[PDB]
Symmetry: C3
Subunit: 202 residues, 3 copies
Amino acid sequence: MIPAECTTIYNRGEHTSGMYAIRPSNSQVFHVYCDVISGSPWTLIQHRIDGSQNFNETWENYKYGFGRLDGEFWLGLEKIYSIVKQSNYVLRIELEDWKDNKHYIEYSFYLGNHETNYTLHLVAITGNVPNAIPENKDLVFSTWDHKAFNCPEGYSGGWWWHDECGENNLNGKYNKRGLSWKSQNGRLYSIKSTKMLIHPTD
Amino acid sequence: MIPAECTTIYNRGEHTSGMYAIRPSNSQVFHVYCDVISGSPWTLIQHRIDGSQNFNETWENYKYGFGRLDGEFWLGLEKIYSIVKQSNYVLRIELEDWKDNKHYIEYSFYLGNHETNYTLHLVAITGNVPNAIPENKDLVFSTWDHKAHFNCPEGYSGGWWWHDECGENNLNGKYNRGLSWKSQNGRLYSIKSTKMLIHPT
Amino acid sequence: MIPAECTTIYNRGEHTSGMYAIRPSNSQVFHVYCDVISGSPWTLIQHRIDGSQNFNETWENYKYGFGRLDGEFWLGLEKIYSIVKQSNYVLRIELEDWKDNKHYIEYSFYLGNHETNYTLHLVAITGNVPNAIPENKDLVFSTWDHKANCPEGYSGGWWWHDECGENNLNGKYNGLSWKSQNGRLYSIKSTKMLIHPT
């Protein structure tokens, strides 16, 4: 009776973005920000705006969530996995630079449970910004107090990593200039604000 | 049990503005922004701040809503009708110009169902700025993909209620300076932010 | 089932700050802002950002609350009492200056009902700033339209004693003044008042 996630909230007639209660299978009720983009609903799992929220958090906090749902936040790996579980989901990354240009990229992904350290497997689909995250590789999540070779760009924040590493840490240190997104070719994008958004494939 | 509208929320002791769940009679639960103005509760049905949200939406999305309840949004004609068909409602239009002067006007009104293309019938009650919307006339809603009648120049873009008289009154129009409000006998008002608000009479 | 306060919300696994419904015993449902500070949940009862909200409100609005839960607001004395009742709670005051620094101070307190004019009785516990509010004294609430006086209290609703002093966080914004008597005057840009159980 309580919707499982944002797509079913949308299909039940809530077509506006905002904060909603959901309850995925085998889970407690918790609140999410549902973000409708061009008529399609997403669950917002990460949001960064100005660096005010410290993202160099513990493993426990990256697992259960931190921040403010009306501002900068991280939903929580346990909550994200409760949504995704064994399903193929779609991940959208939205970056805005300091010149206020908007870039997006979408991936098809699978996510493992806490026993796999929430291993992420991505394949890029579309976007107007080149990919910076290794594709078709098992990416292991790590925090400052919970290391999985340690990537130089993982020194701050919780992120998914492989030996190839890279400048791709959207949960990295917000320098007070923003964040960095270095694609495979070499072009590095200065990032002022980020969103990470998911929705089921079907 | 679940409050019917923002006035119900306020009367049950919740006097802060914010996003709340409501369930109008024989309707599904949905969320609204309750806006209390000078100690008086209102249900906010549209809000425009800086023109970041595109308002040149489909008929389908004007029926069911679009946008961000904590920002720029349109509640949706089906949901507006679900609220108002319960009783009789006052419509408050609030306009902010670029000098940050607040202007307002309040109307008595009734609203038809989808079978009438949500026809609006307005009577101006009070305000501090001239009314620009034809009164005591069936105003038919139209969008870019859903035309009822004659195409008004201020209605090329957006979902709005129109009559043969047209006029510069389309608060869901293209946001440039900003939006335009002008009565037939009055001067043009350049509008930076808008609100549309309803509560029972 | 509706949780009774922000501690239950957090313990149930919602560790993000924000607006949530709650329902203390013998009370209607109402919404609060749960603020998570260093992994500990607090109920935000007062919040001021930039003076956009007018805090020279009437007694009835100070009892039932006013403002925006995601912005500047006052939760309301009746709702604050619904949470605390005759329990001994903990109060935290958060003061942010204009130079971006943050100052805090924590109190043990108990609270009286409306026929008491919501008397506040507190004593400081910790804090990186001196206290400007009289400790271990019964401070009674008053608004511009409801007296029980201090010149710092001509604007806003606040708890007062004969000591007075610039400690009115609900006072007139320009920003706000926090000064212990014969001490440094802090000009405050933003304020937070938070409570949680012991």
